[PDB]
Amino acid sequence: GVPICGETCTLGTCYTAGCSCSWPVCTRN
């Protein structure tokens, strides 16, 4: 849930293992 990954889930993909792809943002827990 916390956006400490700083990745956009726009393409439906996150590089940070553990981060959820909460379109359009990758959030970890």
Q: How far apart are CA 6 and CA 27, in angstroms?
A: 8
- Counting the structural domains of the chain, the total is 1
Q: How was this structure determined?
A: NMR
Query: Within 13 Å, how many C-alpha atoms sit on residue 8's CB side?
Result: 2
- Phi/psi at 11 (5° precision): -95, 5
Facing residues of 29 across strands? none
Paired tokens of 4: 């400490």
6 phi and psi, to 5 degrees?
Answer: 70, 30
DSSP one-letter code for 16: S
Query: Which CA distances in Å does 23 have to 4, 15?
Result: 15, 14
Q: Which domain holds residue 7?
A: 1-29
DSSP state of 22: E
